[PDB]
Write a protein that holds these residues in place. Structure first.
Motif, PDB file in Angstrom:
ATOM      1  N   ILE B 343       0.844  -1.196   0.000  1.00 27.81           N
ATOM      2  CA  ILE B 343       0.000   0.000   0.000  1.00 27.81           C
ATOM      3  C   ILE B 343       0.877   1.241   0.000  1.00 27.81           C
ATOM      4  O   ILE B 343       1.823   1.345   0.789  1.00 27.81           O
ATOM      5  CB  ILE B 343      -0.932   0.005   1.224  1.00 27.81           C
ATOM      6  CG1 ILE B 343      -1.905  -1.164   1.168  1.00 27.81           C
ATOM      7  CG2 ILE B 343      -1.694   1.336   1.310  1.00 27.81           C
ATOM      8  CD1 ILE B 343      -2.649  -1.262  -0.102  1.00 27.81           C
ATOM      9  N   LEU B 344       0.541   2.201  -0.865  1.00 30.44           N
ATOM     10  CA  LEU B 344       1.229   3.484  -0.920  1.00 30.44           C
ATOM     11  C   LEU B 344       0.526   4.525  -0.058  1.00 30.44           C
ATOM     12  O   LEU B 344       1.167   5.268   0.694  1.00 30.44           O
ATOM     13  CB  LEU B 344       1.298   3.965  -2.367  1.00 30.44           C
ATOM     14  CG  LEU B 344       1.735   5.409  -2.590  1.00 30.44           C
ATOM     15  CD1 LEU B 344       3.177   5.621  -2.123  1.00 30.44           C
ATOM     16  CD2 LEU B 344       1.554   5.753  -4.073  1.00 30.44           C
ATOM     17  N   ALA B 345      -0.791   4.596  -0.180  1.00 26.34           N
ATOM     18  CA  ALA B 345      -1.590   5.559   0.559  1.00 26.34           C
ATOM     19  C   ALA B 345      -2.999   5.007   0.628  1.00 26.34           C
ATOM     20  O   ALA B 345      -3.467   4.354  -0.307  1.00 26.34           O
ATOM     21  CB  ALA B 345      -1.564   6.944  -0.108  1.00 26.34           C
ATOM     22  N   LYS B 346      -3.670   5.272   1.740  1.00 24.69           N
ATOM     23  CA  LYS B 346      -5.009   4.727   1.925  1.00 24.69           C
ATOM     24  C   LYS B 346      -5.764   5.613   2.899  1.00 24.69           C
ATOM     25  O   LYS B 346      -5.212   6.019   3.924  1.00 24.69           O
ATOM     26  CB  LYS B 346      -4.922   3.285   2.443  1.00 24.69           C
ATOM     27  CG  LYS B 346      -6.238   2.533   2.505  1.00 24.69           C
ATOM     28  CD  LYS B 346      -5.954   1.043   2.695  1.00 24.69           C
ATOM     29  CE  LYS B 346      -7.175   0.303   3.178  1.00 24.69           C
ATOM     30  NZ  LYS B 346      -8.229   0.267   2.139  1.00 24.69           N
ATOM     31  N   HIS B 347      -7.022   5.914   2.572  1.00 25.81           N
ATOM     32  CA  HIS B 347      -7.890   6.584   3.528  1.00 25.81           C
ATOM     33  C   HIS B 347      -9.339   6.309   3.166  1.00 25.81           C
ATOM     34  O   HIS B 347      -9.710   6.400   1.992  1.00 25.81           O
ATOM     35  CB  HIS B 347      -7.662   8.103   3.567  1.00 25.81           C
ATOM     36  CG  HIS B 347      -8.529   8.804   4.565  1.00 25.81           C
ATOM     37  ND1 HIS B 347      -8.549   8.454   5.898  1.00 25.81           N
ATOM     38  CD2 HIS B 347      -9.407   9.829   4.430  1.00 25.81           C
ATOM     39  CE1 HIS B 347      -9.417   9.217   6.540  1.00 25.81           C
ATOM     40  NE2 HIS B 347      -9.944  10.067   5.673  1.00 25.81           N
ATOM     41  N   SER B 348     -10.153   5.999   4.180  1.00 26.99           N
ATOM     42  CA  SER B 348     -11.611   5.956   4.056  1.00 26.99           C
ATOM     43  C   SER B 348     -12.185   7.039   4.960  1.00 26.99           C
ATOM     44  O   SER B 348     -11.987   6.994   6.175  1.00 26.99           O
ATOM     45  CB  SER B 348     -12.178   4.591   4.465  1.00 26.99           C
ATOM     46  OG  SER B 348     -11.510   3.521   3.822  1.00 26.99           O
ATOM     47  N   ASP B 349     -12.886   8.015   4.388  1.00 28.17           N
ATOM     48  CA  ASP B 349     -13.244   9.204   5.156  1.00 28.17           C
ATOM     49  C   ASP B 349     -14.683   9.151   5.661  1.00 28.17           C
ATOM     50  O   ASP B 349     -15.621   8.945   4.884  1.00 28.17           O
ATOM     51  CB  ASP B 349     -13.030  10.481   4.344  1.00 28.17           C
ATOM     52  CG  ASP B 349     -13.013  11.714   5.224  1.00 28.17           C
ATOM     53  OD1 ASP B 349     -11.984  11.956   5.889  1.00 28.17           O
ATOM     54  OD2 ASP B 349     -14.043  12.433   5.254  1.00 28.17           O
ATOM     55  N   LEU B 350     -14.847   9.382   6.963  1.00 30.33           N
ATOM     56  CA  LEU B 350     -16.163   9.337   7.600  1.00 30.33           C
ATOM     57  C   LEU B 350     -17.100  10.446   7.138  1.00 30.33           C
ATOM     58  O   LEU B 350     -18.318  10.294   7.273  1.00 30.33           O
ATOM     59  CB  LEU B 350     -16.008   9.415   9.120  1.00 30.33           C
ATOM     60  CG  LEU B 350     -15.625  10.741   9.798  1.00 30.33           C
ATOM     61  CD1 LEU B 350     -15.739  10.592  11.313  1.00 30.33           C
ATOM     62  CD2 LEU B 350     -14.215  11.231   9.424  1.00 30.33           C
ATOM     63  N   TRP B 351     -16.578  11.559   6.622  1.00 27.03           N
ATOM     64  CA  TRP B 351     -17.434  12.689   6.261  1.00 27.03           C
ATOM     65  C   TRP B 351     -17.645  12.826   4.759  1.00 27.03           C
ATOM     66  O   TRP B 351     -18.758  13.128   4.319  1.00 27.03           O
ATOM     67  CB  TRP B 351     -16.849  13.992   6.814  1.00 27.03           C
ATOM     68  CG  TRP B 351     -16.876  14.073   8.313  1.00 27.03           C
ATOM     69  CD1 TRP B 351     -17.859  13.630   9.140  1.00 27.03           C
ATOM     70  CD2 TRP B 351     -15.867  14.642   9.154  1.00 27.03           C
ATOM     71  NE1 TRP B 351     -17.527  13.888  10.450  1.00 27.03           N
ATOM     72  CE2 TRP B 351     -16.309  14.508  10.485  1.00 27.03           C
ATOM     73  CE3 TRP B 351     -14.635  15.250   8.912  1.00 27.03           C
ATOM     74  CZ2 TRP B 351     -15.560  14.961  11.570  1.00 27.03           C
ATOM     75  CZ3 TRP B 351     -13.896  15.701   9.987  1.00 27.03           C
ATOM     76  CH2 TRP B 351     -14.366  15.558  11.300  1.00 27.03           C
ATOM     77  N   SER B 352     -16.612  12.599   3.952  1.00 25.46           N
ATOM     78  CA  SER B 352     -16.780  12.719   2.510  1.00 25.46           C
ATOM     79  C   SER B 352     -17.320  11.445   1.880  1.00 25.46           C
ATOM     80  O   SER B 352     -17.870  11.500   0.775  1.00 25.46           O
ATOM     81  CB  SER B 352     -15.450  13.103   1.859  1.00 25.46           C
ATOM     82  OG  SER B 352     -14.562  11.997   1.834  1.00 25.46           O
ATOM     83  N   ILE B 354     -15.554   9.094   0.692  1.00 28.03           N
ATOM     84  CA  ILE B 354     -14.635   8.629  -0.343  1.00 28.03           C
ATOM     85  C   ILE B 354     -13.696   7.586   0.245  1.00 28.03           C
ATOM     86  O   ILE B 354     -13.099   7.801   1.306  1.00 28.03           O
ATOM     87  CB  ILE B 354     -13.847   9.806  -0.940  1.00 28.03           C
ATOM     88  CG1 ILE B 354     -14.802  10.774  -1.643  1.00 28.03           C
ATOM     89  CG2 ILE B 354     -12.779   9.306  -1.907  1.00 28.03           C
ATOM     90  CD1 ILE B 354     -14.140  12.048  -2.094  1.00 28.03           C
ATOM     91  N   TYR B 356     -10.261   5.472  -0.731  1.00 23.66           N
ATOM     92  CA  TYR B 356      -9.121   5.721  -1.605  1.00 23.66           C
ATOM     93  C   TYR B 356      -8.004   4.761  -1.241  1.00 23.66           C
ATOM     94  O   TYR B 356      -7.619   4.685  -0.072  1.00 23.66           O
ATOM     95  CB  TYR B 356      -8.660   7.172  -1.442  1.00 23.66           C
ATOM     96  CG  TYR B 356      -7.449   7.623  -2.234  1.00 23.66           C
ATOM     97  CD1 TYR B 356      -6.177   7.499  -1.712  1.00 23.66           C
ATOM     98  CD2 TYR B 356      -7.599   8.246  -3.468  1.00 23.66           C
ATOM     99  CE1 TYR B 356      -5.064   7.946  -2.414  1.00 23.66           C
ATOM    100  CE2 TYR B 356      -6.504   8.701  -4.175  1.00 23.66           C
ATOM    101  CZ  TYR B 356      -5.243   8.557  -3.641  1.00 23.66           C
ATOM    102  OH  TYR B 356      -4.148   9.013  -4.350  1.00 23.66           O
ATOM    103  N   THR B 357      -7.505   4.018  -2.229  1.00 21.77           N
ATOM    104  CA  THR B 357      -6.348   3.147  -2.032  1.00 21.77           C
ATOM    105  C   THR B 357      -5.450   3.224  -3.254  1.00 21.77           C
ATOM    106  O   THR B 357      -5.936   3.195  -4.390  1.00 21.77           O
ATOM    107  CB  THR B 357      -6.750   1.682  -1.792  1.00 21.77           C
ATOM    108  OG1 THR B 357      -7.761   1.607  -0.778  1.00 21.77           O
ATOM    109  CG2 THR B 357      -5.537   0.865  -1.373  1.00 21.77           C
TER     110      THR B 357
END
Ligand SMILES: [Cu+2]
Ligand SMILES: [Cu+2]
Ligand code: NA
Ligand code: NA
Ligand code: NA
Ligand code: NA
Lengths: 620, 620
Positions: B343-352, B354, B356-357
């Motif tokens: 994994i290079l970068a990862k985020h799952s956002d509670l507000w948007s 979105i 992303y992986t």
């Protein structure tokens, strides 16, 4: 049939029924934690008793309870009412995440602060942040969350790009009261967006990356039986899952010829804390125990084939409880696969003429969790040569603030007017050791430099010394990278063929430990984080380095209280607790979404085997 | 057409002709080193002049010579006779490897020592070991090798299992004289074999490993042009090869939108030394400069597809000179390929909402060398996010001795009666820096702890401090893992969009440096190894941390002499020299062939880019 099997949906449904019938799960109740208890020492009875531990919150203000249930027998074993001013509050509930924002949206003080900044209340997100214990006497025994605000310009906007600095609020989430609103002054809300999927920010996507295909045409080399028992390249273990700790490894053993040899009875990340180093009153209280306060297992991601886990992947889908006791599956929450790992051993010999090469590989067990802005990957690795390694991968979005005009000694600038406070991410690994059985001891090994002189006439000699840690009061140890310090866990009653005790060596990364002043609230509540290594005598109820109820606990629980017993640890059933962490001074490159950074530790055999354990690996 | 292209066979053939015609390559001459010289600073003339440096040994006892030749113009530029008692002896020749054994086989003192041990001379191998500088006045200005003996029971036997302890000989390889034979007593020759391909030792090979197939169905993502110029995922560089240093990286740069931005002008491992910590007179002289004395590039292995390098591999086959000036190709001596890196970068956002992986990958450039018992892999890694990493992989067979009855403080036991002396493997990386150009400076960065008090009332603040190194006399630095010490190389004249100087941060592993007493011969000859970081001002002739002629040099050459010039390094053309190493207390698991252990360092961007450089990576 294994006692270490994952919790099933039917088990959780039975727990719900038992609690409901006992009168413990009325409409005012919420389950804040539910988990299966490990078997007691001496499970050679085959008498299975699956027991679950439950923390029950009451939204009406009644005292919470800790309850132990036997699902095999259908009974409540014990139920204790908790005095939270004494022993700590229960973990944050997922349903409380929205409550802070909703309560502030009707508070006149909050609205006046937003109005002065010309911010529409409908666009303001409030993070639900754990409170800690500071100077506010009215908070003792109350369930408090603190709120910091971020602006969302539109529903898909990254709010982290728009912190509202100079403003913080405290809320009592049971009484539904806003206790304090603190406004220290108006800071401009940073205006640049941080939308890392916006083409205006990314530019055109690369077309230069060609595919890498990783396949296993005969399937994987490991087997999974009984749902969660793994056998792979002489390794044997059970993969557990707990909503607080996440993935837990049980019964790690290695098949050495005829014998299954234990190494680690239970391995877990038993706590993790993120202390912030910004002295502004808006954030100086910030210390998030992502494990103990929020429970990292309940926010585990569903991992996507090809994106999160690449190759021939075997998934586990663990089951947890929701707040009402219903079973909830985390689909594809754990990935398992083997990976090529380069050269294992190689030699070309000038005298024998033999050229020899063998390749290494590792077994990977991983999950990924998301807590607010942070995303963490937890990776356990088993290697062919007996090495065990843990790696944490930190990514997500950095927690932001305004960047003050004139600069800051405690905040990095990421974008015009946008700051990121300095912080650490500190983990505690709990390793219930079982090197060839349960009679273990820990030795600290330092390099020894020697002076030129008699017996060392050319001044080239160097050596090593080992110090046995005999009692808990002397088993709180610090790293020393300059002297090459490591720790060896050995079994004094189990010898290799050279008549030396078998052992494993723990190699730390020697990163800084907790930087806060030793008189601070966080140094008291996260005392484990102030030292690199602790050794305790095994006890059933000594599970976490911070104690059972971390939220708003005044401090000193966990490891400092355990080691005061000063128990014998020299050839006994012992537990190693290793502190390790990342110290994060954010860089521009961490924005708007952070590339992975890593930290971890590893254990390598140290005379555990009678010779290299990978002589029987074939030539590919 | 590039001046950084690999040496061709035709170039080496022309050097041979030029030297022969000049009268410098008669039958008594041997080429001990031959290599292409880098272009001088200010190559913006396009006037190519390919020059080669040659060290010429004379087997008749005449003085050796250092010669510089221009192959483009066909002329000898300079030729200097060397006084080896002053400036050091030439590197060990491959043809001398056999000479020590052959000379000892006719020496009556050697034969008498073997006869007392009932060892047949035809079975005794003698290692050709570099001599160092100790108390023996007769060795000054003579070309000496020392010999230690190992028994081969049969032609395919591993001699390392059968050391002949208590015996050492010194030989003058030019005069063909055995100067000393030292016999301190009879030790039993360990009898167990160490034949790691013998089925009696391996047991039945595993049948449990299933294949892992790594393929690139569209080919690799990098391109190779001009023989050795690589372009990969915005990186640009040239891959060189030198018979002393091995793989050398030139002109490392990153394409940041419109601009090619330099980072590192030249990166190499410029020295490596293996000091032994056994005070026995049989081995207390042992310190092998594998790079400076033996030349690691000339022993590079031919790497086999599927075994040494797995995946879609692009090979380079560098050309070197043999001892007579003939070109010799090292077929498949360098592997290049890209690897998935999780994994290079990862985020799952509670507000948007979105999710992303993105996945990471790295470019690998590697070679593997064998020097006697040791085998080392040298790996350079380039990552998508701008990180540069070096990793050394150490394997092969440990150097052995007898294990004394009654034990040892300086030797590990591996098998009945078989010992392995403690030692280190210490590397020097030479990084000729070019962060956004040649005006660079180095800052030392320490974490700063802060006391609870006014301005830090909750005791949570922490900070960092940076100290600029302004002159060479203050640029000899030590690690401090406890304070999180790193070093930043920045360009004060090149700012990012926040008006901060662009930079890269060097992260060390903080392993112990040289353990020998500071008054020892090895501390004088390997002074670079006593400190973690040195910074010098660039100079054409300051190539190696140990000087040009390491063999039998009395000491102090290289870095301690360079920094005495006390040159300005604050915003200048500078070179960073980083010492890093492994301290090896051998374990039973290292025998009879050692699983890989690793050490290295990495550099990460530190405000070099205006935001994350991997926002344009597509979603797999
Ligand atoms: Cu961070
Ligand atoms: Cu070694
Ligand atoms: Na309390
Ligand atoms: Na234990
Ligand atoms: Na000299
Ligand atoms: Na430079």
């Amino acid at each position: 049939a294994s006692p270490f099997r994952l919790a099933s949906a039917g088990e959780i449904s039975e727990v719900q029924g038992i609690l409901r019938t006992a009168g413990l799960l009325g409409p005012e109740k919420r389950i804040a934690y539910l988990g299966v208890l490990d078997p007691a020492r001496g499970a050679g009875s085959e008498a299975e008793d699956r027991r679950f531990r439950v923390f029950i919150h009451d939204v009406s203000g009644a005292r919470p309870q800790e309850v132990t249930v036997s699902v095999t027998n259908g009974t409540v074993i014990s139920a204790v009412e908790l005095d939270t001013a004494a022993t700590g509050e229960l973990p944050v509930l997922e349903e409380e995440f929205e409550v802070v924002e909703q309560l502030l949206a009707t508070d006149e003080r909050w609205l006046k602060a937003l109005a002065a900044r010309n911010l529409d209340v409908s666009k303001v997100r409030v993070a639900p942040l754990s409170a800690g214990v500071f100077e506010y006497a009215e908070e003792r025994g109350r369930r408090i969350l603190r709120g910091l605000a971020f602006v969302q310009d539109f529903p898909e906007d990254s709010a982290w790009a728009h912190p509202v600095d100079g403003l913080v609020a405290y809320v009592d989430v049971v009484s539904k009261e806003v206790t304090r609103v603190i406004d220290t002054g108006v800071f401009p809300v940073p205006a640049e967006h941080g939308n890392y999927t916006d083409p205006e920010l990314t530019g055109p996507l690369r077309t230069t990356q060609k595919p890498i295909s990783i396949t296993q045409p005969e399937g994987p080399s490991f087997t999974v039986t009984g749902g969660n028992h793994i056998e792979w390249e002489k390794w044997s273990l059970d993969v557990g899952f707990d909503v607080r700790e996440g993935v837990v490894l049980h019964n790690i053993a290695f098949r050495d010829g005829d014998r299954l040899r234990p190494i680690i009875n239970r391995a877990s990340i038993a706590e993790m804390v993120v202390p912030y180093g910004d002295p502004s009153p808006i954030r100086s209280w910030q210390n998030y125990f992502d494990t103990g306060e929020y429970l990292v297992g309940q926010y585990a991601n569903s991992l996507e084939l090809g994106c999160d886990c690449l190759g021939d992947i075997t998934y586990l889908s663990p089951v947890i409880s929701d707040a009402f006791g219903n079973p909830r599956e985390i689909r594809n929450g754990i990935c398992m696969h083997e990976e090529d790992w380069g050269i294992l051993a190689k030699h070309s010999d000038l005298w024998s003429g033999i050229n020899y090469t063998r390749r290494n590989r590792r077994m990977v067990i991983s999950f990924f969790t998301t807590i607010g802005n942070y995303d963490y990957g937890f990776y356990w690795y088993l290697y062919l040569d007996g090495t065990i390694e843990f790696e944490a991968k930190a990514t997500g979005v950095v927690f932001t603030s305004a960047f003050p005009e004139g600069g800051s000694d405690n905040i990095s600038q990421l974008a015009p007017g946008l700051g990121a406070p300095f912080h650490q991410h500190i983990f505690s690994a709990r390793l219930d050791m079982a090197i060839d059985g349960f009679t273990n001891r820990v030795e600290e090994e330092d390099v020894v430099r020697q002076t030129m002189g008699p017996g060392n006439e050319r001044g080239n000699a160097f050596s090593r010394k080992r110090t046995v840690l005999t009692r808990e009061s002397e088993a709180v140890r610090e790293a020393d990278a300059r002297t090459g310090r490591t720790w060896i866990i050995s079994n004094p009653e189990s010898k290799n063929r050279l008549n030396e005790p078998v052992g494993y060596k723990l190699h730390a990364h020697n990163q800084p430990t907790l930087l806060a002043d030793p008189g601070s609230s966080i140094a008291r509540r996260a005392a484990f984080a102030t030292k690199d290594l602790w050794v305790t005598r095994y006890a059933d109820d000594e599970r976490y380095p911070t104690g059972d109820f971390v939220n708003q606990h005044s401090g000193g629980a966990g490891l400092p209280s355990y080691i005061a017993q000063d128990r014998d640890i020299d050839g006994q059933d012992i537990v190693v607790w290793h502190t390790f962490g990342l110290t994060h001074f954010p860089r521009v490159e961490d924005w708007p979404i952070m590339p992975v950074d890593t930290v971890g530790f590893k254990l390598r055999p140290e005379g555990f085997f009678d010779r290299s354990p990978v002589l029987d690996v074939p030539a590919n």
